[PDB]
Write a protein that binds this ligand. Structure first.
Ligand SMILES: Nc1ncnc2c1ncn2[C@@H]1O[C@H](COP(=O)(O)OP(=O)(O)O)[C@@H](O)[C@H]1O
Ligand code: BEF
Ligand SMILES: [Mg+2]
Lengths: 88, 511, 107, 93, 98
């Protein structure tokens, strides 16, 4: 018994896994990796994310919706001067 | 093909002139060429190659089945569940094996929980047929492919819902005799991927089988029906507006007779109540219990959005889980040691009545089955089963293949002390027999009443030697009340026609 | 007379009437010259072909018949002019130019 | 709903350069993506210059200079010719 | 005796693989819930488009990718072959991103 509560430890941010991280680094061209990188990366990626996400959400309400659109986030990207092609 | 197509109409056109009407209602290939020329111009002894006795309706179904074969027309063995319809099929496969002497390639499909039973019953009754449980891994399925399946060293093959989709390509190259489809409920959706994998195989006959008939709609009815004889209908909305949904506008309820008259000589229903074979009905009680006062805090916290700062993207399920069990909301159990005691049954609305009924049924010797929707909730029941120290076996969605068999065997073992039996709803009760059990209880209600009917009759089949005492759990003053009423709504829109078919901040700068 | 498209009149392929409308609703000025929709529209053809021709070249170098963003990624990023032009452009699914650092090469 | 885009014209130009090469759809969307961008960047740049000299109407003088401002080096050099050739062709035609 | 490669030869092989590959390296299910996690601190209870859900990753990766290769430049200049966070932070500071 007492197994209904045995796995409550998700805490999303590790969901970006070390194998992927190195897989990411391997595509980038890094040959060998410190172990503290993985965690430090988690910080860099997240802090990146909301700033757009904030801006990305920042649009949504102004047009009085409740469902985030790619075009919305498309504009979100442009404002910081990193433009993307391919989602209209 | 066309000779059979002419020969199919030899039996199709012998019915009412409605088939000519449907052929002439197409808005047309050369089916008219063979229609115009026609327009202007056994084994009732329970054959003993089986090892046992066939029931009288069983023979009739088989004789009805052999007629469809001799007619070269298709159909659906729609006999009510637990009427030994597996024996009817096993006898029918013997009918082809011995009378016509064509032991050939056969394909049968069963839910994951049920592949054991069909192999078990085929061995018990007609041991002369080569069948496999096509289970195992990607490599473990391969040596079945090249060695025996590619070697044509078999008669029937027993696979699951997904395996055939996993094995579509190695199965196309083998032409079949029937595609035997048990519990044909995934086919209700045309876009259900299993439908597009089955319209691609080439078998001379296509024997669809079910435990319950159509669930909700006429659209669904010809969804089963369109794959039966596809070259004949080849139409989707043509069939629908032809019958116009039980006269949804005029409510004549007399054009339904035309629906019944085509399907009565095209399809077969038998019910348990008519030919008992068990001579004992089942009881039903709906244990309306009040929703627990302790969780009333969180239930209000869900209604008023008071615990906080989470999703409510499906308020349906959120209230459903609170209607089901409070500790499911990730914090209703505050204990860092996660105490396991009477507080669980205390804080829960249902388990108090469950604890009472478990104590009663323990003394009465009632061998109970429990069905539920949430596998996570079953963990708590598994924990609470540990609290009461009952023997049992937990089958859940994707536990194992051999574990399903062994847990079933231990529960159905003679004089099995496994007093309770944890089981899911959509993974557990789709064809297995549990005659060792008598009483079956639902923890929660499902938005599919025929599935509710499908699940309940697990213990109430041929071989049930006690009175089936159903105790459905419905929460008082809850949203579960509306689901059951809606469950009744979908029930009565369907039962009414089926019964006719059989009969006929500011200034705070950080700086 | 006989209707004759301006793009034909310039001997161009790009729809100038579309843009003169678009310039008109684009609120870039309250009045707009006539050859400006024209003037840009041809140069529009120039760069697409310029990239498309590069897109064709790389497409051949893997011996495919249909152009993909990886090709597009390769082409522009292989072009120092385009890459300088599109430095703030990131390409969907485009991938990266294969390039390993000299010191990562083994002795 | 109606949606207007640039695929057909891009498709025509491709068959000008590579009359045999095919094309995906996503990359075509990229092309639609790309064209609109440079479409935008020139125009507002074109607008603000007319603002800088306080004029009210945008002609090729406006368009060309920003093309020189926007395109680097050889593209600007070559494309101005591409612009220059068409304009005279239009005025003559 | 086991045939183990010299450490790094595998990595150079890996480095090659992905530099021709073009696909994502981040699992979708972990990925989107991250965003669904994040949205709460701005507005409760939004509803995401997969296209948007997809579109996040490309920026997510492309950003982090360009980070890596710059960070790779660091240890080389720092006469290393193993990357340190001090490299990573350094670029972002050189990127002027702290
Ligand atoms: N004529 C018969 N003779 C002996 N046993 C039967 C007969 N009909 C049904 N049974 C028993 O009743 C049970 C019903 O199982 P099955 O035939 O699989 O029904 P279903 O196919 O509807 O699930 C079987 O285990 C079978 O042994
Ligand atoms: F009645 Be059968 F087991 F589906
Ligand atoms: Mg049966």
């Amino acid at each position: 018994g007492a197994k209904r509560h045995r796995k409550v430890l998700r805490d999303n941010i590790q969901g970006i896994t070390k194998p992927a991280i190195r897989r990411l680094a391997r595509r980038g061209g890094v040959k060998r990796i410190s172990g503290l990188i993985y965690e430090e990366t988690r910080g860099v990626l997240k802090v990146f994310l909301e700033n757009v996400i904030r801006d990305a959400v920042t649009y949504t309400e102004h047009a009085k919706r409740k469902t985030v659109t790619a075009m919305d986030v498309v504009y979100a990207l442009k404002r910081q001067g990193r433009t993307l092609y391919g989602f209209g | 093909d066309l000779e059979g197509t002419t020969k199919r109409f030899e039996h199709l056109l012998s019915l009412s002139g409605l088939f000519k009407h449907f052929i002439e209602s197409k808005a047309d290939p050369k089916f008219r060429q063979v229609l115009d020329v026609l327009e202007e111009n056994q084994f009732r002894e329970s054959p003993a190659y089986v090892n046992g006795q066939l029931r009288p309706y069983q023979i009739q179904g088989v004789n009805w089945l052999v007629s469809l074969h001799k007619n070269k027309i298709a159909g659906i063995l729609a006999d009510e569940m637990g009427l030994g319809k597996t024996l009817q099929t096993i006898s029918f496969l013997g009918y082809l094996r011995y009378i016509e002497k064509i032991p050939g390639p056969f394909l049968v499909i069963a839910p994951k929980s049920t592949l054991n039973n069909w192999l078990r019953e085929i061995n018990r009754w007609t041991p002369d047929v080569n069948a496999f449980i096509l289970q195992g891994d990607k490599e473990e399925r391969a040596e079945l492919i090249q060695k025996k399946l590619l070697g044509c060293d078999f008669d029937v093959v027993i696979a699951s819902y997904e395996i055939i989709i996993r094995e579509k390509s190695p199965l196309k190259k083998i032409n079949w005799e029937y595609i035997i489809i048990d519990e044909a409920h995934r086919i209700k959706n045309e876009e259900s991927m299993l439908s597009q994998v089955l319209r691609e195989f080439t078998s001379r006959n296509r024997l669809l089988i079910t435990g319950t008939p159509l669930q909700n709609n006429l659209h669904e009815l010809w969804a089963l029906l369109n794959f039966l004889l596809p070259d004949i209908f080849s139409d989707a909305q043509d069939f629908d507006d032809w019958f116009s949904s039980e006269s949804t506008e005029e409510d004549q309820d007399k054009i339904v007779k035309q629906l019944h008259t085509v399907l009565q000589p095209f399809l077969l229903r038998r019910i348990k109540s008519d030919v008992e074979t068990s001579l004992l009905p089942k009881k039903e009680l709906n244990l309306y219990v009040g929703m627990s006062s302790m969780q009333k805090k969180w239930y209000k916290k869900i209604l008023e959005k008071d615990e906080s700062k989470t999703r409510l993207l499906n308020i349906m399920m959120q209230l459903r889980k609170c209607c089901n069990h409070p500790y499911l909301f990730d914090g209703a159990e505050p204990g860092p040691p996660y105490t396991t005691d009477e507080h669980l049954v205390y804080n829960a609305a249902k388990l108090q009545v469950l604890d009472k009924l478990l104590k009663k049924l323990k003394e009465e010797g009632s061998r109970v089955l429990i069905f539920s929707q949430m596998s996570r909730l079953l963990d708590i029941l598994e924990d609470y089963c540990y609290f009461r120290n009952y023997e049992y076996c937990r089958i859940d969605g994707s536990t194992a293949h051999e574990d399903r068999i062994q847990a079933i065997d231990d529960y159905n073992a003679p004089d099995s002390k496994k007093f309770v039996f944890l089981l899911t709803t959509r993974a557990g009760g789709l064809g297995i027999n549990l005659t060792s059990a008598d009483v079956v209880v639902l923890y929660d209600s499902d938005w599919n009443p025929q599935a509710d009917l499908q699940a309940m009759d697990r213990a109430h089949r041929i071989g049930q030697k006690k009175q089936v005492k159903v105790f459905r759990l419905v929460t008082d003053n809850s949203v579960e009340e509306k689901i059951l009423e809606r469950a009744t709504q979908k029930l009565r829109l369907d039962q009414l026609v089926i019964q006719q078919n059989r009969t006929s901040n500011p200034t705070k700068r950080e700086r | 007379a006989k209707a004759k498209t301006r793009s034909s009149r310039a001997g161009l392929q790009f729809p100038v009437g579309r843009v003169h409308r678009l310039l008109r609703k684009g609120n870039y000025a309250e009045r707009v010259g006539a050859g400006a929709p024209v003037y840009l529209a041809a140069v529009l053809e120039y760069l697409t072909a310029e990239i498309l021709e590069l897109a064709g070249n790389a497409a051949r170098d893997n011996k495919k018949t249909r152009i993909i963003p990886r090709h597009l990624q390769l082409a522009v990023r292989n072009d120092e002019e385009l890459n300088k032009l599109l430095g703030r452009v990131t390409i969907a699914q485009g991938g990266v130019l294969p390039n390993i650092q000299s010191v990562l090469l083994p002795k | 709903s109606r949606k207007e885009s640039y695929a057909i014209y891009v498709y025509k130009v491709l068959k000008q350069v590579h009359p045999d090469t095919g094309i995906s759809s996503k990359a075509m969307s990229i092309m639609n993506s790309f064209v609109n961008d440079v479409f935008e960047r020139i125009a507002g740049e074109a607008s603000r210059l007319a603002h800088y000299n306080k004029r009210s109407t945008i002609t090729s003088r406006e368009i060309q200079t920003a093309v020189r401002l926007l395109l680097p080096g050889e593209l600007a050099k070559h494309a101005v010719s591409e612009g220059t050739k068409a304009v005279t062709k239009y005025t003559s035609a | 005796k086991p045939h183990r490669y010299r450490p790094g030869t595998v990595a150079l092989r890996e480095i090659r693989r992905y530099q021709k590959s073009t696909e994502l390296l981040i699992r979708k299910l972990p990925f989107q819930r991250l965003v669904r996690e994040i949205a709460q601190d701005f507005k409760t209870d939004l509803r995401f488009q997969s296209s948007a859900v997809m579109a996040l990753q490309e920026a997510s990766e492309a950003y982090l990718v360009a980070l890596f290769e710059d960070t790779n430049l660091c240890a080389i200049h720092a006469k290393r072959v193993t990357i340190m966070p001090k490299d990573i932070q350094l670029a972002r500071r050189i990127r002027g991103e702290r």
